[PDB]
Amino acid sequence: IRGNDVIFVLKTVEAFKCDELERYIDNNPECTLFESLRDEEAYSIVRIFMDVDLDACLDEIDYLTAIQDFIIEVSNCVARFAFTECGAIHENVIKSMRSNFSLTKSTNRDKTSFHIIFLDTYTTMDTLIAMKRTLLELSRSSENPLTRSIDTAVYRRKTTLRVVGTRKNPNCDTIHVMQPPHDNIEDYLFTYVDMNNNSYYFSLWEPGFISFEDAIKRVSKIFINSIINFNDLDENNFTTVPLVIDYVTPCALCKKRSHKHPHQLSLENGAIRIYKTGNPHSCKVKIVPLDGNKLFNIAQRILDTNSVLLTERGDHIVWINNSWKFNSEEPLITKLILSIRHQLPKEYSSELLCPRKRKTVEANIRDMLVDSVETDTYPDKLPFKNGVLDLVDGMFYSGDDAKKYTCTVSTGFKFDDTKFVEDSPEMEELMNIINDIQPLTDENKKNRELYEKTLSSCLCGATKGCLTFFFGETATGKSTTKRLLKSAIGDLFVETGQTILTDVLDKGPNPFIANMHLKRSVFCSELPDFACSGSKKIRSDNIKKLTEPCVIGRPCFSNKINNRNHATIIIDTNYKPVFDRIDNALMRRIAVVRFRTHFSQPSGREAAENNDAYDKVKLLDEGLDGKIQNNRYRFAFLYLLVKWYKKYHIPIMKLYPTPEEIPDFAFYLKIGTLLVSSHIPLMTDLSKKGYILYDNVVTLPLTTFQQKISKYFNSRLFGHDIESFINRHKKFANVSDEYLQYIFIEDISSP
Amino acid sequence: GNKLFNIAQRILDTNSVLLTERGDHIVWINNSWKFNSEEPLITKLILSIRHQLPKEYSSELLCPRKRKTVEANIRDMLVDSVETDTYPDKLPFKNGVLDLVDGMFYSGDDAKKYTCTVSTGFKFDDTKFVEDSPEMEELMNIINDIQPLTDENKKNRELYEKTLSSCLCGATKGCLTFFFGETATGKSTTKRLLKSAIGDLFVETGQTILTDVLDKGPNPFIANMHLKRSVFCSELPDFACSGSKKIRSDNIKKLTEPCVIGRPCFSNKINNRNHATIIIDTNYKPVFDRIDNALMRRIAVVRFRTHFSQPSGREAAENNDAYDKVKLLDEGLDGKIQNNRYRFAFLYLLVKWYKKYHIPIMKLYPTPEEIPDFAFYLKIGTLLVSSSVKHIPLMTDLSKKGYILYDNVVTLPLTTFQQKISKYFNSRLFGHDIESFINRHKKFANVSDEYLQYIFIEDISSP
Ligand SMILES: [Zn+2]
């Protein structure tokens, strides 16, 4: 659509532009033109507009407060309707609606009418048609005289709206005068679509009220004083007889001792309006409802601010003090009900001070929350205690903006821009520490890049399909890297023991199984070396099961077993891992990060001078570990992590395994590179080489195979591995021995 | 007269709340039978079905102490129980029900009749549930790659299609299919496609219950499956690993039974219904601790011959007898599986296979010929025959061929039978199996005499 600059009008027809309409209006002040839609189907996208009419006069203060509350209520209700039905964003709609709006007026001083248009919000006419019932409920479920007077009509096909500055009728001289700051004729058109940057768009007496006597009693209680002309009002004289009151005490509505004329009660929109006659500003207007609870309307107003949603599992997440809290032990809805009373009208705030009413208006909220939402869906954002830091752009959001993202976890500490710097001595000290841990030589280049990549994945809410191994001799200070990462990433990071590396992953109630829920990094240290006999091999089942994007595990006294998996798993030790089970999936799901830095004191430095444990040796310092424990380089290291993530995270970043540094998998690699599955039309070459083919399957004797492979590989090194491989690929039968099928790649190449 | 009872009667008369055999209530809120017991939904329903009442009645459902009274009346008025999901030829989505008999999807009150609780967890809008979509051709290309349409690949592809189509039929299937390849040669691809297609109903498992004890304990794994239309057990524990566990045949028989006896953790509701297909993805050969004629009827074998490799090792993959055809590895396949792009195309393919095979049923047939070990256990019986009436009249005619006659029955010495069996079977490999088969069929006439009532078919054929 890209907006429309043509305004179609009806004289009781034309298609004029902004300048054309302005010139025509200036030429003819008395012309009556109604702005409508030239074609309903073509340009159904229009602005959001409302028309309000209340036949009474109000002063400046009352009008100001009433219009403020009217904007608040209408914007919240429309944003809630957009969120539930049109799939929009609540915060965006609220911001667009409250940012800028055009408000007209009426030249008549005996009544208050206007047409209000929200400039930046645009939606299809079908959406405004569907909003009919919701807006009618809002109109009939409020106390504000402006909100109660909303005309739900004008939401029909091919509707028309009276243009500003033109008389509605030739006989009626009253016209609507524009108000600051718009002052332009294009700012009061409900079809003038002007989509731009700061904008948003979305799309898909009746007896039945109450007994008369109770209404009369309510009116009398409002008047406080007794009615002089009592026992005279009935069904017929409801809006005819004046209400004469004795001025025993000053009027509750006006606070004055007396007035020139009595009051009068009228019926409108299922409510009773009490107003004085003669001078209009002598007494205010009193509104009396005729249906609905008072505790249900409060629940609706608290609900349609989108602050008490429920999760996809069944937990009600509330928004208190700029953070999405939630607890399943002491539910927080009553805290929210108490703390939100300031954003509610005067009559709705005194109710939320009795604890027996903040349980009624809370049962209502729980009964109105049907269907769920999804939490922590955007993985490129880091939730801090006072907001959300964006990673792709680096901009920080605080306050209601962070509400847009259902961040159910947090790092635990606030975000400070002063410490968040680039050129600081702490940054240089951290860079020196990292260089000491990771020398930047060309030999280390690839390993250092893998280090930076696997260390920067901690700022990702997505799931990763690899498990990097920190392999390095002692005194390499991997604990320093662990401490720096913990200080940078807050309480999201978790350190776990080897309990998951040996036992069954799910099995029974495992605390680390549930703790992997939404934690962004899991670290294991000092692995139980399986080189010595007795220690269990690294459970291949657990490693395979930890890679999936889901976690299945239920702790003691619980039933939930589904957890979202975001943690990057890192294992650090000085011993090569040993896994009893081996398959191609394992060979494609293991990465190794090598450490070649020795941090040793001078006393043993000579002992480390010729040591083969590390490719370099340098003096250590006991005064650094405490510094890392004191969150010294926290924000500089966080900046480094952000830079690494930016330089590494392409539109799709993946953890690539490195199956070359693991000594155990080298045997399988050598076997595969020298022997694979056995090619029918190559019998002559096999016969020349000595091998024979029988029953369409080339075979050799088991003793012959052992003799052939004796020289190719060291039998004493991996005799158990060779026996296990033979058992796995065993075939048996045939001739007078077992059957072994393979191709000697080294012999296959040689003719 | 007592408006709070008229409201309860009116809400009850729309059949929105039902009582189940398990003791809980199911309500029809938001186009889904929200079976739940933690936070009862009867008050949510009472608030929801509120405009569908006269104006005088509808203004009293705004007080929680009156929604609770209406709930009490409903609970006291229910009384009797109705069964849960029973229709097998249906597919419930969180946006309605799809009838696979005619492939017609619809929601609302028309979907209320089928009390289908468990759903797929998403919505179906027939966006691309058609045959003219190019996505159908894109998925069919991968199907041809994994399963070639070669005329030689007829029985294998037929079993593949049947085992996939059985994932939608909600009855009890009495056959287990084994996926036998070399190393993830499209098995993971098919598993991901099946998971994307249906979802929710799919369950993934590895070993565990398939090998351990399936009863006699609080074992929750067996009770975890319930009304799930597909259970997929991958990574069999490679029986030939010098101590690897052996899968019990009784566990297999229990899995293929219409009912499952499994005690949930700290619960007394042992009985469970079976609506799942047992599919096993295995890299090595299947070896069982005990094989009997009963197990012959419960095994189906599906093979793969195309391996997913890359041009980096294309030559290495081409020189392996495991793979019959090789294609370059894809990286966008992971993205497509992650974003569920091929949902509707794969659902349409499954529905078409269902229509093709359901004539008028989708029965599964075991195929034990592909299993290597199972061959001898039946060939031993095939190579011989129990003595019959016709063989009984042989008398000395059979004895002239080295046999003996006892109790008007042809029988041979144990050593002679052992020599005859070893002359046509792998004695070293199946020595224990041969001994067990002899012992089961052994006939004892005395302490020293051990003569079996079996005669080799070769002697019978030879005149
Ligand atoms: Zn007054």
Task: Write the residue in A208, A541, A743 that is nearest to B55 by C-beta.
Answer: A208
CB pairs under 8 A between A and B: 72
Give the resolution value in Å: 3.3
- Distance in angstroms (rounded) separating the CA atoms of residues B198 and B93: 9
Task: Write the residue in A370, A677, A724 that is nearest to B48 by C-beta.
Answer: A370
Query: For residue B309, what is the nearest residue in chain A, using CA coordinates?
Result: A584
Rounded (5°) CA angle B1-B4-B8? 110
Question: Using the beta-carbon criterion (under 8 Å), do B206 and A366 form an inter-chain contact?
Answer: no
Q: Do the strands A550-552 and A467-471 form a parallel or antiparallel pair, or are they unpaired?
A: unpaired
DSSP state of A163: P
Mutate one of A727, A731, A749 to test the B interface: name it (highest B CB count within 10 A): A727
| B202 Rama class: left (phi>0) / alpha (psi -120 to 50) / beta | beta
Task: Write the residue in A368, A544, A679 that is nearest to B321 by C-beta.
Answer: A679
Q: Do the strands A521-525 and A493-495 form a parallel or antiparallel pair, or are they unpaired?
A: parallel
DSSP state of A183: -
8 Å CB contact between A467 and A591: yes
In 3D, which of A548, A381, A540 has the Cα closest to residue A464?
A548
- Distance in angstroms (rounded) separating the CA atoms of residues A208 and A291: 9
Number of neighbours of residue A252 by Cβ within 10 angstroms: 13
- Distance in angstroms (rounded) separating the CA atoms of residues A33 and A30: 9
Residue for token digits 């080489």? A689
Distance in Å, alpha carbon of B337 to nearest chain A alpha carbon:
13
Residue for token digits 């969150």? A631
Q: Which residues of A touch B426 (CB under 8 A)?
A: 732-733
Rounded (5°) CA angle A237-A242-A248? 130
- Distance in angstroms (rounded) separating the CA atoms of residues B78 and B25: 10
Question: Using the beta-carbon criterion (under 8 Å), do B322 and A677 form an inter-chain contact?
Answer: yes
Question: Using the beta-carbon criterion (under 8 Å), do B238 and A581 form an inter-chain contact?
Answer: yes
Question: Using the beta-carbon criterion (under 8 Å), do B183 and A291 form an inter-chain contact?
Answer: no
8 Å CB contact between B74 and B15: no
Distance in Å, alpha carbon of B360 to nearest chain A alpha carbon:
39
**In sequence order, which residues have a C-beta less than 8 Å from that of residue A45 and are 6 or more positions away?**
A1, A122, A123, A124, A193, A201, A203
Question: Using the beta-carbon criterion (under 8 Å), do A677 and B321 form an inter-chain contact?
Answer: yes
Q: Catalytic: A747? A: no
| Burial B315-351, CB ≥16 within 10 A → b, else e | eebeebbebbebbeeeeebeebbeebbbbbbbbbbbb
Mutate one of B235, B323, B340 to test the A interface: name it (highest A CB count within 10 A): B235
**In sequence order, which residues have a C-beta less than 8 Å from that of residue A453 and are 6 or more positions away?**
A644, A648, A653, A655
Task: Write the residue in B30, B55, B429 that is nearest to A733 by C-beta.
Answer: B429
In the beta sheet, which residues pair with residue A390?
Answer: A381
Q: Residues whose CB is under 5 A from ligand 1 (ion)?
A: A 251, 253-254, 283
Write out the H or E segment, with its range, that includes residue B116.
none
Question: Using the beta-carbon criterion (under 8 Å), do A727 and B241 form an inter-chain contact?
Answer: yes
Q: Which residues of B sit within 8 Å Cβ distance of A?
A: 29-30, 38-39, 41, 43-44, 47-48, 55-56, 59, 62-64, 67, 182-184, 206, 235, 238, 240-242, 283-284, 316, 319-322, 335, 426, 428-429
Distance in Å, alpha carbon of A732 to nearest chain B alpha carbon:
7
Q: Which residues of B touch A581 (CB under 8 A)?
A: 238, 241
Q: Which residues of B touch A141 (CB under 8 A)?
A: none
- Distance in angstroms (rounded) separating the CA atoms of residues A548 and A552: 10
CA of A209 to the centre of ligand 1 (A): 26
In 3D, which of B87, B161, B119 has the Cα closest to residue B362?
B161
Strands (E) in A168-293, as ranges, are 200-202, 263-268, 271-276, 286-289
Q: Which two tokens stand for residue B6?
A: 């008229």
- Distance in angstroms (rounded) separating the CA atoms of residues B433 and B284: 20
Q: Do you find a cis peptide bond into B258, omega within 30 degrees of 0?
A: no
Query: For residue B56, what is the nearest residue in chain A, using CA coordinates?
Result: A208
CA of A295 to the centre of ligand 1 (A): 28
Task: Write the residue in B43, B63, B183 that is nearest to A293 by C-beta.
Answer: B63
- Distance in angstroms (rounded) separating the CA atoms of residues A324 and A313: 16
CA of A62 to the centre of ligand 1 (A): 15
In the beta sheet, which residues pair with residue A524?
Answer: A571
- Distance in angstroms (rounded) separating the CA atoms of residues A541 and B244: 14
Question: Using the beta-carbon criterion (under 8 Å), do B64 and A676 form an inter-chain contact?
Answer: no
Query: For residue B318, what is the nearest residue in chain A, using CA coordinates?
Result: A679
- Distance in angstroms (rounded) separating the CA atoms of residues B324 and B308: 11
CA of A257 to the centre of ligand 1 (A): 9
CB under 8 Å, gap of 24 or more: what pairs does B289-296 form?
B289/B246, B289/B247, B289/B248, B289/B249, B290/B249, B291/B249, B291/B373, B291/B374, B291/B377, B291/B433, B292/B249, B294/B249, B294/B253, B295/B249, B295/B252, B295/B253, B296/B366, B296/B368, B296/B374, B296/B377, B296/B378
Number of neighbours of residue A505 by Cβ within 10 angstroms: 20
- Distance in angstroms (rounded) separating the CA atoms of residues A547 and A562: 15
Query: For residue B430, what is the nearest residue in chain A, using CA coordinates?
Result: A733
Q: What Å distances lie between residue B282 and B183, B185, B232, B253, CA to CA?
A: 9, 11, 11, 19
**In sequence order, which residues have a C-beta less than 8 Å from that of residue A681 and are 6 or more positions away?**
none
Residue for token digits 């030829």? B89
Write out the H or E segment, with its range, that includes residue B280.
strand B278-282
Q: Of the listed A51, A53, A62, A151, which one is catalytic?
A: A151
At residue A265, what are phi and psi to the nearest 5 degrees? Answer: -115, 130
Q: What is the CA radius of gyration of chain B?
A: 30
Helix A445-456 to helix A634-648 angle, to the nearest 10 degrees? 110
Mutate one of A728, A735, A740 to test the B interface: name it (highest B CB count within 10 A): A728
In 3D, which of B303, B270, B265, B268 has the Cα closest to residue B286?
B303
Q: Where are the alpha helices (DSSP H) in B293-452?
A: 314-318, 332-339, 343-357, 372-383, 396-399, 414-422, 431-440
- Distance in angstroms (rounded) separating the CA atoms of residues B50 and B44: 10
| Burial A266-289, CB ≥16 within 10 A → b, else e | ebeebbbbbbbeeebebbbbbbbb
Alpha carbon distance, N-terminus to C-terminus of chain B: 98
